[PDB]
Each structure stands twice: as structure tokens, then as C-alpha cells.
């Protein structure tokens, strides 16, 4: 029983964990692949294995814990102390807030879409699998520094990505308003239908927003993520007459086996998706 047991929220967050650490570690994430992270009602075996853990990894930032979101009662159940046995691996990035928002509590989470905060959050994920089992720290620190490099690699490939598309045509459009970071960082524009995952996400209100700005900047496709109700955006399509071009991965990686079942292959999908489809 001498691994190290860690436990992710997610499954971004636990492919990043794989990718430093390997075999070395015994790794459970909770949100089921396709699933929504920012709202989940942990199974017997989720809360057995945090109660169980050395290590648990949260994306933080409002993503899973807020004071009434389930992250926070699962450690509180699981009598788990802040950065002893739970961290936050956002710690560091320059958080971005909700819109007009400025106060803790009403961050924008999706920071990974950014990929030097994939870095960040990498970094800080072998930062405590070093601190609980120094043992490994050569093979966490090698994986980390070839992770590292090949995250900036294609950080600087999505800085060039969408040069040859025409200024008019770049607006990425998703369910959620979670690209906040990625049009920060890469200079693409993003719409949503609602602005971040909660309870009743696809008013007639908010699509018919989203139709009315779509005749102002009309990009050539729309996308969907991997994680939402397809059903709201099939409606902006049909409205809109713009097809949805992709699935893309925003808040969950693909399913193992499939194309984007990693943190390193979902952005990467995301890019070449997301190129293509705005440069129809
Ligand atoms: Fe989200």
C-alpha cells in the first residue's frame, strides 16, 4: 500500500497528474469523463478514496468550490485541511472574473484553456507529488520539464493558429461562456449561451441573444462542448443557419481511445476544430 494516493476533481486535472507522475502513483478522478465538473454529486467510492488519499487536486477558482458547491462539502465530510491534504492547482494564474465581476468567489474557472496555465497547474501538481513522495521526485521532475516543454510548444503553435482568418469571421461560439482565457491568450473573440454552468442553462432569452449578435459577427460555424446538453446550441443552429461544426473539450477530456483523451490532445483538437471550422 506505499503509493502515493492522489485524487483529482477532474478529468483534466488528473490526466495533467498523469503525465507527471505515471505508474508512480495510485490516481482516482471524480467527474466521469463528459460530465459537468462544476456541479457533481460525489459516489460512496468518491468519497471513500478522498477520505483515503494523500493528495486531492481541485481546479479552484469557482469552478468546484464555492461555498455551497460539492467539492467543498466532500472535504469538509472527508475532514481534509487546505493545502495539507487539498490544492487548488489554479494557485498562481491571473484569474479572470465573470463578467463585470470582481470579487473572490466570482472567478471564472476555465483557466486551462489558456495553456501557460496548463503549465501553471502542472507545475503545481509536481510541486506536491515532490513535497508527499520525495522518493520520486527524478521521475516527477523529468515528466514535468518534458510536459512543460511540449505544452509550450503548442501554446506557441495557438498563438499562430487563426492568423489567416479574417478579423470578421473570428468569434467562437459554445454553450457556455467558458473561452474567456483561451480568447485572452490567443486573440479569438468567444459568444455563449449562458455564462457559466449552473442549474438552468438555455432560457429562450439568452438564445435569442446569442442569435441577435451572430447577425452582427458571423462566423462560419459554431461549436458544441463534449460536456453540455447539445440541445440549446442545435437550437442556435437552427436559428442562427450557422452549423455546428465540431464537438470541442472544454470542461472534460474525450473518453479513452477516442481523439482529445488528454489534456495535451483535447487542446490540440480544440485548435485544429476550431481553425478549420472558423476558416469555412
Ligand atoms: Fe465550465
Known sequence: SDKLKVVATNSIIADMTKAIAGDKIDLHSIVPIGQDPHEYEPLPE???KTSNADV???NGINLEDGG???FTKLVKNAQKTKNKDYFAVSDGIDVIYLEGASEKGKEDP???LNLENGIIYSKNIAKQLIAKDPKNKETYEKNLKAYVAKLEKLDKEAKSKFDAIAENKKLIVTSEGCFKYFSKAY???SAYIWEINTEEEGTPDQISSLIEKLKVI???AL?????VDRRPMETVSKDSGIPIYSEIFTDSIAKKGKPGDSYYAMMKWNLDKIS???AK
Request: no cysteine; charged share 20%; aromatic share 20%.
Open 46 to 48: 468518491d468519497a471513500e
Open 56 to 58: 486531492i487536486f481541485y
Open 68 to 70: 455551497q458547491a460539492w
Open 110 to 112: 476555465h483557466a486551462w
Open 187 to 189: 486573440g479569438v473573440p
Open 218 to 220: 458571423k462566423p462560419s
Open 223 to 227: 461549436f458544441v462542448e463534449s460536456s
Open 276 to 278: 478549420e471550422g472558423l
